[PDB]
Design a protein around this ligand. Structure first.
Ligand SMILES: [Zn+2]
Ligand SMILES: [Zn+2]
Ligand SMILES: [Zn+2]
Ligand SMILES: [Zn+2]
Ligand SMILES: [Zn+2]
Ligand SMILES: [Zn+2]
Lengths: 173, 185, 198, 207, 197, 197
């Protein structure tokens, strides 16, 4: 059977543009792993607007899982290393828009620009959406804040330790 | 309905290593496809059948093969459904449209016993080198040193590894286009 | 017998020319409640041929000596590999074949329809070939005469054929209508003649 | 009354991968270095008619499938022991086999070693798979001989008067199964020549 | 050395056309290469007149003939006997050898094709012979690959040729097309090799 | 030892009249018929590198001046053998069956046709030159003799070629049909003599 997939769910109110986070997050994870995002044995699968829970609980597990397809059968057991959800959770995070980057009533127009400096970890270029300047993440069963860049740093680190240990443990048996 | 699974039947005498061959063959094919291997009993119900990519039919001996003509069929099956892509079987010393390959297993004199059977103890002990496609290390069973499969039609002798690679290619052949075709019907 | 109606589909590798013959044979076999016999490349025997309505000859290039025999009104008794199924006559109503990029008249006649496969630019991958994976995606809508569910392969979105003589454009669905129609009209002629003499 | 074992190359490959071109060219070049010629053994050989002690004998399609007559012939040619091969006509009967090199080819996966396996594989000095590169690949995944034959503009070889993609590696390579090292026609010639120059230096330093 | 020439043999009883087939086959082939035919006499002794013609013919091959035949169809230089000191010296470099012989080890290996010749029933004379006059009479339609006018001798209506290993049938026209194909192969191969050295 | 003179076509136009679209497509259609390809000479050329005896060779911008192009041209279009320059020391006699050239005594006798290009005013920009973006939209119908699919370039809708010597207008597809007819006629000539005898 399989390593449990590391998974990040993003809780927030509409207009926070959470899909802008799970998108930026998944892409940046599928690149490191030279892959794409699924929304064919992809690395990351994005599950946006999660109310679904029987289908989730069957992805994020250690069992072997075969998901339904429209086409009959067709080599496809679910193997995605990461699951990013927006609404088993390695991380469980609240979305927070800095008041500065809020519209009259999130202001993506302003929140998406290129800061002069590029001090990122996982992005070829920097922005307020990844520098933490415009948007932050807080685990709720741990009181740590993240930027888009540092949450993707965490999730790659955690998958790596889980794989090393989880792989040599299964060898024991 | 389905693409008829590729099937190999390994014919051999006793002491020839039939179920070492079939064992290893189906298990390497599984490992490629992130699946496992259902061991059908000799004189076979289908308890434990959990849509494994491969199922091994040992000591084919008729009760047995009226069930085989259903497993290796293009139509569907609900065994006392069956979606395994591969069937590896083995029979006595001495329908066939279903056998994609039909191999006589054969032991090299070097790994023969004094009583003229395979020397599995030694044959099982690993070789240092790996000129192999489907295994992370080989033994004289995978490499043709101890165990070889001679196609009955071709009359040619192959190693287990190369006959593996051929069962995977002949299914990738069926699989490419034929999958979306039925998806349409 | 009634000369089977033949479609040859000419296309370079990658334009998806055996998706076409595959779907076309399968769709004509269903309409006629049969199946499809696929005749292997460089055929020596016809071993699974139990009188399916459609036989497919992919990658036809010993090929045209055969091809000449199947697509005619003369009696063909193909060679079998097992005696247990020998002696039967070749009676498929349709022969769908595909071949390479581009006596000679001896064949040209056999083709009721001689088509080129085209790949729409929208479904053309980087390397100038069919976008195989995208084109299988079912369509929301099914405006087809012959299929239970539509797809860019069936209706005209990914691939289309074009008769070389007539220049008509066709989709997999429309070409199916065109082959069936022709057989209906051949069967209709031949029937009324054998109705006057049985 | 015996001799230095000929340095032997076997080339394994699917048909239509340049296998017989490669044997052709390696033989001819090696033959050029030693100012001799190529004797080509026929398939399923019965008799060596035409074998005039050429430095290289080529043995294409070793072990076509019939009955193993080929591996017994090959074990006699590639040995230290004297060998007087049969001939159809009496006009050239009695000549000893004295090729310094023997180049053979066969299919990709067939096992030609019958029985006494470990001693046979020793005779092969190099036991190579033939691979076409993917630019020179063509539909059906086989070699496009026409293009692979256009003369290269450069000649970096060690052994050829002129160079084409069959010679320098651009179109066809060989990989030594045991060493996993990739070679072109040009560099496996140099290896074969170095190994023979090696065996002659020994024999004569010991005698 | 030289490319072994591709060789065809036409086994047939007398008056089954066997000698017309070799002449027609050899002439057409020689025409395609812009050359002529050198025809060995029966019970050949010498090669007088041989000027390295693309094709040489050998009829009633019955061993003087054999030992002789076996050196023509080879890789190894064969300078054949002359009866005129002025001619002698020439090596044998013909690209094809066409031969015929009587009704019924290592030789069989040198025949690139080996054929029984067949007179079709229609054209059999009153007693199991070729009706040469009528078979020579020309055809109105011309579907041959290698003659500018057609005739039963060439398209397969009069005489046919049956290969004894492949059991395949040929007309004079088609066997001329196999042979030209089979030299083109060898030609092409040994060509790129020679170009390189 | 000498060659059927290739048939030539020159397309005299101001630049921006799809002069280049015209020669490009014309050359490809002809080469696709003869199962070959097209060798494009750079304008004001010096070497023929890449020449492999493509059936069609193209000669963009003829007389751009100083006689460079024209001595090259008179040699390509002739009966006398021709060995063009190579800049890579790379058998390359010039043997192309057609020469399509575009520009801006014994010379004007080698032209088979000698044509002005002409946009039709339905497809003229406000600034005077071919609206390429519209002219390359595929036509739905295909009445052409030499194409898989039709375009106002192929077709005569957007681009036309008028012979100066005779006053016949042409489309890409019908000039293609005339040029082929001419070439096959010149190779008929050997076959038509042989017919009368
Ligand atoms: Zn920033
Ligand atoms: Zn091994
Ligand atoms: Zn559709
Ligand atoms: Zn090179
Ligand atoms: Zn005739
Ligand atoms: Zn048009």
């Amino acid at each position: 059977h399989r390593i449990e997939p590391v998974c990040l769910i993003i809780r927030g109110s509409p207009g926070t543009g959470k899909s802008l986070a799970t998108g930026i997050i998944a892409r940046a994870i599928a690149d490191k792993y030279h892959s794409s995002v699924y929304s064919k044995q992809q690395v990351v699968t994005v599950m946006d607007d999660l109310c679904d829970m029987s289908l989730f609980c069957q992805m994020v597990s250690t069992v072997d899982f075969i998901p339904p397809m429209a086409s009959l059968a067709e080599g496809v057991s679910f193997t995605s290393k990461f699951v990013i959800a927006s609404t088993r959770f390695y991380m469980d995070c609240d979305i927070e828009v800095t008041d500065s980057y809020k519209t009259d009533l999130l202001d993506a127009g302003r929140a998406a620009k290129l800061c002069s400096e590029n001090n990122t970890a996982n992005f070829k270029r920097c922005s307020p959406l990844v520098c933490g300047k415009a948007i932050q993440l807080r685990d709720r069963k741990s009181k740590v804040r993240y930027s888009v860049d540092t949450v993707v740093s965490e999730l790659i680190r955690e998958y790596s330790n889980r794989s090393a240990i989880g792989n040599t443990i299964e060898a024991l048996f």
